[model samples]
Target: PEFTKNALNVVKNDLIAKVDQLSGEQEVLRGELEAAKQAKVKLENRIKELEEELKR
Candidate 1:
């Protein structure tokens, strides 16, 4: 199937944001690390859902 998945852009944008976070204080970085980890889990599930629908 033809696809233009914007999840691709999200991951790169998130990568840039994570890289940008490297310049910040430890407390903020720690919080962002936790948040980004949670985002990863949800985003991964999002990708699987896309495939699950496609397989139907």
Candidate 2:
């Protein structure tokens, strides 16, 4: 029973560490995603402007 409990604790600690690491990575990814979305919007607007200029 003691060995089983020790093994479970080790697994639990490892999982907790992994979850913490992933949470930090997730935050960075979310920021990058937002930046990419903003960049896309800017590009789309620029395309529209160019199209309008061509029409004129």
Candidate 3:
């Protein structure tokens, strides 16, 4: 029972570390995603402006 308890603890600790690492990566990707969204919006607006100019 003691050996089993120790083994479980090790597994739990490793899992916790992996979770934290992935969480950090998720945050970084979220920031990049937001930036990309903003860029897309800007490009869309530019296209609208260009279309209006062409009509004129």
Question: What CA root-mean-square deviation does each model show from the true structure?
Answer: 21.9, 1.2, 0.9
Which pairs clash in model 1?
none
Model 1 RMSD in angstroms: 21.9
> Model 2: per-residue lDDT, tens digit, 1-56?
99999999999999999999999999999999999999999999999999999999
- Candidate of highest TM-score: 3
lDDT per residue, candidate 1, 1-56, as tens digits? Answer: 12446777778899999987775767787899999999999999999999999999
TM-score order, best first, reads: 3, 2, 1
lDDT of each: 0.87, 1.00, 1.00
Instruction: Name the lDDT of candidate 1.
Output: 0.87
User: Measured by TM-score, how close is model 2 to the native structure?
Assistant: 0.85
Candidate 2 runs further than 4 Å off: none
Clashes per model (N, Cα, C within 3 A): 0, 0, 0
Backbone clashes in candidate 1 total 0
lDDT comparing candidate 3 with the true structure: 1.00
